[model samples]
Target chain A: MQPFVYTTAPARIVFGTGSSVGVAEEIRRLGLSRALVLSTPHQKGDAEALAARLGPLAAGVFSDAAMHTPVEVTKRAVEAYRAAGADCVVSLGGGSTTGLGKAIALRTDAPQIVIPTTYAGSEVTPILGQTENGVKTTLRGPEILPEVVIYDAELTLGLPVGISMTSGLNAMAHAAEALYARDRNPIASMMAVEGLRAMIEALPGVRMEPQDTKARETALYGAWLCGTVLGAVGMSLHHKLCHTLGGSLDLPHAETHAVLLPYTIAYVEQAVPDQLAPLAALVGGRAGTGLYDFAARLGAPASLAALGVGGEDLDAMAELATANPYWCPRPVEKTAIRALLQRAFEGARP
Target chain B: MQPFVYTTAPARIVFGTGSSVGVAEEIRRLGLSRALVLSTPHQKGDAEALAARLGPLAAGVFSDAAMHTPVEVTKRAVEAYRAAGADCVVSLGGGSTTGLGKAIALRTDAPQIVIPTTYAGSEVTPILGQTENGVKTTLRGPEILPEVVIYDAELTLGLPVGISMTSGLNAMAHAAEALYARDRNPIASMMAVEGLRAMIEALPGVRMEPQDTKARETALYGAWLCGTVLGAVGMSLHHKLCHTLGGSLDLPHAETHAVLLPYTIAYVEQAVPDQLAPLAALVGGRAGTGLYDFAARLGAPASLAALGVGGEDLDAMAELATANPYWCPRPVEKTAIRALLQRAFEGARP
Candidate 1:
């Protein structure tokens, strides 16, 4: 083979059925006494329960975590972090909570311990996108890396089927792009494609039986694989467009990714046809169409407009999407991207 | 489709042709002063060059690194680390040097800055395997994580074609198994496949034209992808067998992996037919056979016996391979393993 180089990001994972029980213990393992447990407002109960579990080690809960990790919320959390004497952060819930934790870690260089309850694998990646001043920007830092991740399958069992589909699709997008990422590794592609297949097969089972633990486990496994690849590789157009849409219009994080994946995949499928084949086969037939169909099959929205993307802001979103050289499957042509946006906004089948 | 929990491990990456030049400044960025550069005796020149480049920041060079990172060597290096008053380590070579650097960091809790020239992605993993006495054992630790990684394609140009083939194949194996790894993530899988495709495509070019800089860049890119997937996800049977062979028999690292990959892939192909398709297609068909031909095309040894293994050692090696339980595509049976061993030993096409 040709001479090449591969790099792996170092991440500690605590995976098991009841791994969440070790949440406080893991924080202590990191040598941190006080931690601000960050959670979304909807997950305040979990935050309160965790705070009670830690007792004195608990540095209080900051349950204002929101989708896209808005900068204003970070400013308030920074104050809470300082006032609580928090040396680290323990984030619970989905991507939003984890994103908030990353934001704090990015700014203060604090260690983070994230426990995921949905299929948004943000824990293994060094990349963090935060929205401020009407723009979303991303920064990479080891400081934002979670010192320890506790993956408990039980925590995800309570999630609704619709949430599961959107989040799982979000996780799949990470893999789809990574399949053709500049730093794409053989192993990540294998995992990415298989993960897609496993989830595609398992999604139908989930829809048939919402509490199908086996399907949940399989989906979680797929999510973990997809998320890990993203953490290790570079981001491209799929992530950039999602950031733009989510930040500008306040779309649901997972739903935005779920709807836009098909168009983005279709846009770049030609650039990396070889990469797209495995993906197409995994879901059904066509890569982009399969993703769109998969979303619809799971009762999730298949278009940005359906997810609340405003018709008026479409031009601005397209403008911001092509403003910088964020990575993409195909060359980021302005007219083409605007056309892609039009299709996504129109809710047309990819 | 099902309820799932996705975790991401955030890592910052600096990729390009000459990224290693930033090691010293990056170390300073970590607030560390004295840095010990690590390399094997064969790589001392490059380590010394790196140290000299660092000037006052360079504490000294530890060039006693060896394959599998013999515990005795690590103990000595730990002493050397203390003697030099080194606060951090800068590993400037392949797996052996990276392993030594990791062993030192695991013991001293020192930050590490890795500059990798080969596809051995151990630098990016939290797992450290060290050989003590006649046995090699591995453990994962948060402390073993490197603070920074410098992927410089320029550093790989001088890598011999023979070593490049074996090393790149070894790197590919990491992602191959990761694709089917029990803990596989979609993101990790995507990267695994990408890394494999890149390396598989580039290996032949590098073999045909050693000075092909375009091939070198692509291979290095593949290496990054492959190595990161290895670090991000848990590996499966292919890796387990390789580790057992390399550790127990003291076989050469990359070469051993190179010889065993085709057989391992063949053995597991039936159980994971879906998994083998992309790998097969990467080289035109039959993943095991494709890899075997790829290795042969690059002048890599075709069999374990060619690398010094004998029929007499097969039984013991097979026993050791089956000693530890791991997730694999196929069931690990003694008869099948022995047959598999025979095929690998004879250099027969899978």
Candidate 2:
């Protein structure tokens, strides 16, 4: 019953087992005749396969998409897009490819069609975090939002269990923080809880069977809902902390999120127990501790140390995390943050 | 876990107590200067009050908006809008006023800001049902959707308890049908359930204490969510039947819906028990029968017969309803439709 303002985003999502096959028709439906396919070098085969499926609708391929959407990478992508006479960009693979599409759209205003092959939920957001001179600056606007998102779980069937585990946990963190977000609205909270429930139920099954279509479908759907919350509301402590850690150390994105999520939840658990109660019920114990066990059971990264973060890095990261003022339910304290990071580095149960 | 296509609409909602006071700012935010205030003649006072609040931003007031949004009314409203050189519209009443705003937007492509004072729930939707020469035709598009909806619970505090009961029930039907809608997506279904829960919990409290600000806020919030689901997904039997009854019999809109909802639900209950099970538990009994008792307990019209629908009217209504094919969980049978209408007319427990 609290006063709140909610603005709905304009995005269309097509989800199922093999929705990727309908990309050409979707492109035609969008009134765009030509599409340049985008992907990281590692996923160039998937991009080429989609281009083949699209046939005449496929203009060309730009497989130089990088990790953090660098300006140089976008300049090259724009050139390739213009050379191909492309009216739109079809992004294949994960966040890197989607980020490239967003960067291209920001300059050219070309519509984007994203086919996410992993659980990187950035495909549903209007956010673009691009690296220029090794410093990433994130910006958000409607122009950066994809025109359409096609989530075909069949594409995720090839993901290795370890990648899937961390990626799924990464998506879960968005929904987890959304529950107690500073600008939390009832509808967003409902979507967050539903997203959390679906992720918790589906991740275990996907880990047990890498190609379980049902499990993959549920996880991807959960990721879509979680991504929606991430885009709609403002994130607080966990997100800011993760951003600091990821930027300061050049660690892997999803792994950093998976390793830090439970500890972050533990830090805020006492401050927002009422908000976290339903999540506790779903996780079958205390929300933070339950998530720790859940991640361990799935063989996800147990510590920042395991991810190559030395003990000394924690102090700098902690200082940087608390230095910036942000909206966390609990007040930020240097000692508390440093001690929390130490526990995270040591892989202790919070 | 079902495969679904979810499309988010680009609509901004500002909700809270006294949120209507910000309408002038919202109008400016849409990049419009002069705003013509719209409302029914009965609600002209509210419109004038708002216009006074807008001061220089207010172009004029048109209090000619009518039921069913007749074409002639829209024609006159458009003339007023043009005469005043209004850049946008501010509708300050229920569905009638909101419908006028939509009709004007359809012709002029002017942005609309609606402040709903009843549980009519039309402000949140893109659908417009307009009556021209005794024929009501419905159409939906992005342009028909208001650019912004300002829901101020304080405005609804003046609504009569009788109107509130029927209007609240009318809003509930939209969410109820959306749960089993043919085009149902997880997001819409989630909104539907949450809306239903809030409405069911808030309605009786408001009935007992008409000045209960908390109850009023919850009901308004519920109606907004329900209206969102209505806009996002297709509604089935209950909605169509209410339309037929209202159009064919010239029945009072909300009362007609309140009387027919439970019966329509009963007609389709066996076909979608899995979908209705959660609602059944929420209602504390059989879904259809529980809704019947709910309306009756709130002193809402208990039967079509009580609303002046003659027993003889059932046959022709059934013929008209089933003549056109529509999407429903159960096949529409002429005999079944007749019996359902008969039971609704008689106020029999489902």
Candidate 3:
């Protein structure tokens, strides 16, 4: 019953274990023909495999997509796209690949169908960031939203075990942050709780059996919902803290989130225990403390120090985190952040 | 983890107590300056009050919106809209009034803002039905979706107690049918449960003190969510049964639903006890039996006999209900429906 405004861009989500195989059907359903498949170099094989399955529906393949969706590659892909006479595009990988598809949509207004392989979920958003002249600028518009997202958990079966664990934690970060987002709406909150529970129950099975289809489906379903919340709402402390750490220290993305999530929640828990209670109860303890235990039990990276942050880096990181006016459960405090940083650095339990 | 496709039109929902006051701001937010206000004769005062609130933002008020959105009324409204030179439209009142706004939008392509005064829940959908020369035809398109919906509990607080109770049950029927919908997706199912819980908990307060603001807010919030679920998914048996009762017997709409909902659910419960379990738990017993108690407790009419149906009419009603092939929790057996009709006629507890 909280007063709020809720809005979402028009999009379609096709989710299941083998939904990728129906990409052509979705394309035809929309009256689009000749899809140009997109992917990062590492996932070129996945893109090619899906294209082969698409048969006559596949117009061509462009696999040079790169990090930050470099505009040079986007221009080249546009050339490849027109040469193949394709009117639609399909992205068949994670964030980077989906970014490429969005960039193409921006230029050509071509409808997009995305099949995400990693838990990094950019496929369901109207957001795109492209780098040119070493400057990365974020772009957003309704036209940038994908026409359809085909979530096939089967595609994630080959994800590296290490990345899969961290990515699971990373996706959970989106849902966890969503619960306390300042501009949160009820539907997104329902989605956040559902997404968190799905990951909480599916992550252990994912770690134990990397190729378990049932577990994979639950995890991917969690990713789709989590990614949806991320697309819908603004994130506060956790996302800002992680951005500060990753941007300054050059730490890996998912690991940075995995290590700092508990600390960030510890900071937020005292300010809004009531808001965090649902997630806390789900974790079987206080929100921050239980999340720490849950993450530690999954054998995920437990500390910033383990991820290469030195003790000397804490002061500068805290200053950078507090330098900008930002949203959090409570007002950002330099002293509080520095202390919280120490706990995350040393792997101290919340 | 069940595979499904979910799609929603682009729309904005502004919900909470006293949200109607912000309608002018919302209109300006959408960069629409002049707005034509719409309503039925019954709510023409409400329309005028809203127009007075809008001041300079109001282009003109057209309070002639009628039932089933007769085409003649739409033509006159379009003429009024053109003369006012309004760039947007705002609908005040229930289904009939909202339908006028949709018809105007269909012709003018102007954005619409809906302020619902009852639990009819016609605000948050793309579906529209218009009657011409005594023939009604349903119409649907993305353009028919309202650009904004403002759910102000204050507006619905004045809803007649009799209509409020039945409208509540009528809304519940949408959510109930949504749970076992053949095309049910997880998000809508989550909404259905959340909505059902809200109404089940709020209706008694509404009956006890008709002007209870907190209870009214909860009820209107429930209606909004329930309506959203109805818009997003298809309904089966419960809706079909109500339709047959209303279309054939000419019983009042919400009352017919209030009377037949429990019976319809009792019939469905035997087939999908598992799917109906969540709602059953919400009601503290079997879904149908508990709902029957709920309706009877609220002083809602609990029998077709009370609504003027004759006992001799059961045979023909069953034939109409089972005549056209329809979707339901179980196969629509003629004998079973006939027996169920008999039970409903006498107000037998499920």
Candidate 4:
């Protein structure tokens, strides 16, 4: 009941076990005549199959999406879109492909229908970070946010268990940070808590049975909610640390998030006890410790060292993370961040 | 986790105690330079005070808003709006005033800033039901939705406790039925559950201390969320029953809704146990019995007879309620509806 502001962007979400089958219908619903399917090179089969399913509505297939949404790759995709005369982009893979679709939308103003194959949640956000000449910069606008997001759990049935665990954990990190966001509201916080609960409950089941449709559905649903939070609210220390380590050291995105989540949470848990306490209850223990053990039990990467982060890299990562200080429940202290990174580097449970 | 479609209208809500103080600033933020203040005749003095507060920005005051939003009243208000050279409407009362603002917006496509003084939550919904001649019809469109809703708890601190109780309960009915809305999705359901919890928790406190700002804040917040659900999803048995009763018998709106809610809910509780079970737990017993008892405890009217509905009205009312077939978790059996109205008529606890 505290004073707050609540605003929402225009978003249409279609969710189900086999919602991908409705891609052509959703595209048509957007009033676009032709869709060019997009995917990472690794997911060319899915892209091709989706294009085939679209039949006459399919303009072409562009399966050269890459990590960090390289502008060069976007340029190539834009040329392909123009060549195919696509009226819309159907992004059929993970964040990379979705990012390509968003980038295309940003340039061409064509509508997008994103089908997420991983727990990477950028599909629901207005922000797009594109890398150019080894530098990544993020831009946010309505043009970058997809008009439609189709969450089909069956599309994720084949995701590697390791990738799924790490990606799901990465998704949780957004909601966790959202719970303590500076501009948090009741709706976003509700989504945050509920998303965290669903992911935590579903991740273990997903690891136990990779094709557990119910578990995948729950996790994907949670990811969508969490992604909405990420798009709607600002993040604090946890997101900043992950961004710093991932950008400066070039560690894998989800793995870096998985490894450092516990340590980053522990550092701010006391400062944000009001927010973290309820989250701790959701996890049934201390938030940081519960998350660390949860990831460890799920066989997610527990150590920055395992993800190829050298102990020597901690100093620069810590410095860069603290240099451009932003809003956090706890004040950013160089020593604390270094120690936190050291614990993550050593894979020590928070 | 269910297959569903979730779509959201663009809304900006500023909530808090004394939030009406920001009325002029919010108006300017919407890029409108002049605003016509609106209210029901009974709230004319308050409307004038708000206009005075807005100073040069206040174009004039139109205080003829009527029940069910009569088109005649809206036509007169539109003339006043044009004469006053207003670019936006600042509605400063409850549902009637908000409806008047929406009616004008529907015609003129002007922006609106609604400051609700009661639990009548039309401020946030795109739906508008306007009375023309002797018939009433409803319409939903983005143009009819307010661009901004300012929930200032201070305005409700002076509301009569009886009115507050009934209006809050009326708001609760939207959420109660939203729990089982045929087109329901999880986001709307989450708002339903959370809104129900807040209203149930805060109503007694408001009754105990009419000046309790905290309780008023919580109740108004619950009403906002419940209103959002009403706007976002379809309502079923409870709403239709209230509409049928109020339209036919000329009964009081909120009081009629409150009186019929428990019985209608009881009638459907058995049919949608999955949906009603959690609600039951929230109320601490059988859904219908718990709601009936709760209303009784709050000194709310528990019977149609108490609200001036005679036994002779039950049969006709029941027939009219089921005349046009509609969706409900439980089939709308004429016999069942008659019995339900009879119980409501007698104020029998379900």
Per-prediction TM-score to the true structure, in the order listed: 0.66, 0.97, 0.95, 0.97
lDDT tens digits by residue: candidate 4, A246-344: 656667888988998988888889777778876798778899998888888899989989988888888988887875554787888888889888999
Tell me the docking grade of candidate 2: medium
Using DockQ, rank the candidates from best to worst: 4, 3, 2, 1
Question: Tens digits of per-residue lDDT for model 3 on A287-318?
Answer: 89999999987898999999999999999888
lDDT tens digits, residues A209-317, model 1?
8787778777777777788778767778888899888887788889888889999998889678787899988877689888887777888887777887777877888
Candidate 1 residues lying further than 4 Å off, grouped into runs, are A1-10, A31-41, A44-89, A100-111, A124-143, A179-191, A232-241, A268-278, A281-286, A303-310, A316-339, B1-350
* DockQ metric, candidate 2: 0.79
Question: Stretches of candidate 4 above 4 Å error?
Answer: A322-326, A333-335
What pairs collide in candidate 4?
none
Candidate 1: CAPRI quality band: incorrect
DockQ of 3: 0.82
Residues A1-350 of candidate 2 have per-residue lDDT tens digits of 56788887677899888789889988998999899999999888878988988888999999999988999999999998988899999999978889999999999998999999888888888899998877679999989889899999998888899988998898889998998888898888998899899899899999899889999888988998899889878888888888887877778888888999988998899799888887888877688998999899889999999999887777789778988898888898999888889989999998
How big is the positional error of residue B178 in model 2, measured in Å on the Cα after superposition? 0.4
Evaluate model 4 with DockQ and give the value.
Answer: 0.82
Candidate 3: CAPRI quality band:
high
- Model 1 backbone overlap count: 59
Two-way TM-score contest, 3 vs 4, winner? 4
Q: Report fnat in order of the candidates.
A: 0.14, 0.89, 0.90, 0.90
lDDT of 2 by residue, B1-350 (tens): 67788887888899889787788789878888899999998799989988998999999999999877888989999999999999999998888899999999999998999999888889988898887654466788999998899988999888889989999998899898888988888789889888889899999999999999999999999999889899988688887777777766778888988999888887788789788776777788877888888888889997898889998889988887875545799988778888889998998788
Candidate 3 local lDDT, B146-208, one digit each (tens): 989998898887788999999999999989988889999998999999999999988999999
